[PDB]
């Protein structure tokens, strides 16, 4: 079951996207849709986790992405995620 957790511990998965305006921590193998837009960077401690965004939002380009451990990403604002799979 994967919650929105403001990142109690370390080594999890975290997204901050509106430039580092809003950052999500997520924890557990849990698997849920999610939605973020303008992902600039993502973080992920030493956990495999798949995110599942979409590039453009007017065409299905759907887009995924694998982050290793301790893991990050910063692509440069991400329309909107769609949803979070966590392994």
């Given at each position: 079951?994967?919650?929105?957790?403001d990142?109690?511990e370390?080594?999890?998965?975290?997204?901050?996207?509106?430039?580092?305006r809003?950052?999500?921590?997520?924890?557990?193998?849990?698997?849920?849709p999610v939605?973020?837009?303008?992902?600039?960077?993502?973080?992920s401690?030493?956990?495999?986790?798949?995110?599942?965004?979409?590039r453009?939002?007017?065409?299905?380009?759907?887009?995924?992405?694998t982050?290793?451990?301790w893991?990050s990403?910063?692509?440069?604002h991400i329309?909107?995620?769609?949803?979070?799979r966590?392994?």
């Open positions: 079951m994967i919650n929105r957790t990142c109690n370390n080594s999890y998965l975290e997204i901050h996207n509106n430039e580092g809003d950052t999500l921590c997520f924890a557990n193998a849990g698997t849920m939605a973020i837009y303008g992902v600039n960077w993502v973080e401690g030493n956990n495999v986790v798949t995110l599942q965004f979409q453009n939002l007017s065409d299905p380009r759907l887009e995924t992405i982050l290793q451990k893991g990403w910063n692509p440069g329309h909107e995620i769609l949803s979070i966590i392994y």
